[PDB]
Amino acid sequence: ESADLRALAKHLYDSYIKSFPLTKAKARAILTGKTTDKSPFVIYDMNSLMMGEDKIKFKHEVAIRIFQGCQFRSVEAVQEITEYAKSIPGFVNLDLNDQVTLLKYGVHEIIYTMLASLMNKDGVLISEGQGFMTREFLKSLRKPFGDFMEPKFEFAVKFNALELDDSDLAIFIAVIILSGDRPGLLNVKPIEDIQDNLLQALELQLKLNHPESSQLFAKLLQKMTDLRQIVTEHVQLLQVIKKTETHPLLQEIYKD
Amino acid sequence: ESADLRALAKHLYDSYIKSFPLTKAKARAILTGKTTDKSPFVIYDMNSLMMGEDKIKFKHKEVAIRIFQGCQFRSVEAVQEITEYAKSIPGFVNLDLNDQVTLLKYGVHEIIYTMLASLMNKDGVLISEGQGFMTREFLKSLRKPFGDFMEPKFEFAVKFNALELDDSDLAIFIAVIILSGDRPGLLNVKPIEDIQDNLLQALELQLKLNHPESSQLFAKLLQKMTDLRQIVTEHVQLLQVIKKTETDMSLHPLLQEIYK
Numbered sequence: 001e002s003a004d005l006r007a008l009a010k011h012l013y014d015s016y017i018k019s020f021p022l023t024k025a026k027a028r029a030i031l032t033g034k035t036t037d038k039s040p041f042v043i044y045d046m047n048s049l050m051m052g053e054d055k056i057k058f059k060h061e062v063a064i065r066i067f068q069g070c071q072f073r074s075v076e077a078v079q080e081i082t083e084y085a086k087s088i089p090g091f092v093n094l095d096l097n098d099q100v101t102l103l104k105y106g107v108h109e110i111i112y113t114m115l116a117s118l119m120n121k122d123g124v125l126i127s128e129g130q131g132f133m134t135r136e137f138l139k140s141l142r143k144p145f146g147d148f149m150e151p152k153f154e155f156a157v158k159f160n161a162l163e164l165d166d167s168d169l170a171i172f173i174a175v176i177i178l179s180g181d182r183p184g185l186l187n188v189k190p191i192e193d194i195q196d197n198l199l200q201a202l203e204l205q206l207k208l209n210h211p212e213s214s215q216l217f218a219k220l221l222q223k224m225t226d227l228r229q230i231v232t233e234h235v236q237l238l239q240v241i242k243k244t245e246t247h248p249l250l251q252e253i254y255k256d
Numbered sequence: 257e258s259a260d261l262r263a264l265a266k267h268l269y270d271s272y273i274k275s276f277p278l279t280k281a282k283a284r285a286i287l288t289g290k291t292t293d294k295s296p297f298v299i300y301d302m303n304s305l306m307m308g309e310d311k312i313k314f315k316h317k318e319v320a321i322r323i324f325q326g327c328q329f330r331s332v333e334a335v336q337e338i339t340e341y342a343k344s345i346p347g348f349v350n351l352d353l354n355d356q357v358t359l360l361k362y363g364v365h366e367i368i369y370t371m372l373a374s375l376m377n378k379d380g381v382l383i384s385e386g387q388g389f390m391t392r393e394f395l396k397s398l399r400k401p402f403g404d405f406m407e408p409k410f411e412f413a414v415k416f417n418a419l420e421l422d423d424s425d426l427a428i429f430i431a432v433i434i435l436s437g438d439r440p441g442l443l444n445v446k447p448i449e450d451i452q453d454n455l456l457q458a459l460e461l462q463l464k465l466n467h468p469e470s471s472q473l474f475a476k477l478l479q480k481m482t483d484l485r486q487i488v489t490e491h492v493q494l495l496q497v498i499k500k501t502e503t504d505m506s507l508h509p510l511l512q513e514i515y516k
């Protein structure tokens with residue numbers, strides 16, 4: 001019944017709010033919004049990063065130090081997503097090796113998804129939204145690194161064209177984690193039974209929440225392919241990056 | 257209204273029977289055994305193959321290369337049919353002309369491997385209008401580069417075939433593929449994207465009437481549009497290996513053009 005999907009929907013939004021500090025509705029204000037409640041330090045020069053890097057609350061060559069920090073968050077979101085996943089009804093009851101797998105692979109698609117929420121066409125928010133690093137600056141970086149985030153900007157700008165909100169992404173995010181075609185799973189029926197349930201709940205969500213936006217649920221699913229390619233070809237930089245910087249205890253934190 | 261979509265569902269099925277002579281319904285009857293009039297000749301090793309040329313017509317220099325140029329000739333004949341089918345898609349011929357070409361350049365191969373599964377099972381694939389059948393094992397067993405071309409298509413086919421789509425559904429899905437905004441180099445994307453909402457609308461309603469028990473098949477089907485791109489990519493690159501280990505073997509120009 002609809003009452004049950006609407007239930008599971010509210011459920012997942014709630015976990016989404018608890019598990020994820022910086023929400024999209026929150027970041028949208030902080031971004032180009034007109035609210036003067038605060039003003040993120042903008043990073044645009046080389047002469048503004050190191051001037052910001054003194055006054056900010058960062059926890060850590062420049063083209064490399066910039067990369068490493070985008071890796072500090074990846075290791076953070078990995079935890080936020082994991083905690084969110086545990087609240088997805090049935091996820092903890094799956095076989096445990098299977099949970100690790102679903103998360104091993106979904107993490108990289110969940111990250112770029114919610115990164116699109118901190119992104120507009122000119123840059124991206126940083127450090128809980130206390131920063132905005134311009135896209136023009138990120139292109140300007142040493143050749144192994146200059147096209148690091150350019151694909152994610154390009155993809156974000158399309159994904160945001162959909163005008164999803166946090167209530168939409170919550171159910172969307174969940175569908176990714178339950179992909180059920182990940183390498184190496186062992187009991188696949190329950191993963192799919194859950195995904196079907198979430199995919200149902202997504203469909204009713206966008207229909208209730210964007211009745212004018214027609215066939216939006218169908219457009220959203222094909223953005224999941226756009227993601228699987230972003231991640232495919234993001235690994236191809238992440239391998240070639242192991243052909244530049246060439247820590248022991250740190251490499252263990254960041255390994256893969 | 258419902259009925260507008262069911263009319264568009266019928267129109268595309270009708271173009272589909274007329275544009276493709278090897279439907280999934282023909283393929284599935286040859287493969288099963290519903291007959292003794294349409295049984296195929298099976299090519300399980302080299303020695304079969306020289307006999308199959310006696311008993312079937314293949315207008316075909318070594319074996320891995322002639323089998324491969326075999327796939328080329330068929331590919332070219334495949335593009336010609338999809339180009340024909342595309343022309344029947346309401347609105348497609350009304351687009352900007354440089355865009356028709358673009359949608360076709362990028363869509364033609366996602367579609368080939370889609371309807372290739374119609375002709376595949378776990379054990380092999382139908383060749384020559386269904387007159388033959390080449391074991392997956394034989395295809396894995398060809399010379400170092402070529403014995404890998406068919407395998408991911410076999411892999412995609414076994415998952416895809418599991419959806420149990422018939423021709424009435426595939427006709428709509430093929431047309432959802434062609435009309436894609438996401439194609440690089442497209443001039444005016446809104447009129448394309450507007451068509452596809454309607455094609456998608458049709459596919460959603462079609463997949464529900466034709467497959468009620470099968471929950472979320474529309475969703476599930478839209479997902480496998482990911483696996484196609486991954487097979488095109490894997491091909492394009494492995495196709496570049498051949499053209500430089502094999503600088504004597506040629507490439508049909510149509511294929512050559514639609515391959516940037």
Ligand SMILES: Cc1c(C)c2c(c(C)c1O)CC[C@](C)(COc1ccc(C[C@@H]3SC(=O)NC3=O)cc1)O2
Binds near residue numbers: 326381390406495
């Ligand atoms: C003689 C013959 C063969 C050998 C045959 C097929 C037919 C119809 C034949 O008549 C079809 C299945 C098939 C396994 C070919 O299936 C493929 C079709 C396309 C492709 C990709 C090619 S490669 C390229 O550069 N562009 C393509 O379409 C690979 C396998 O082998």
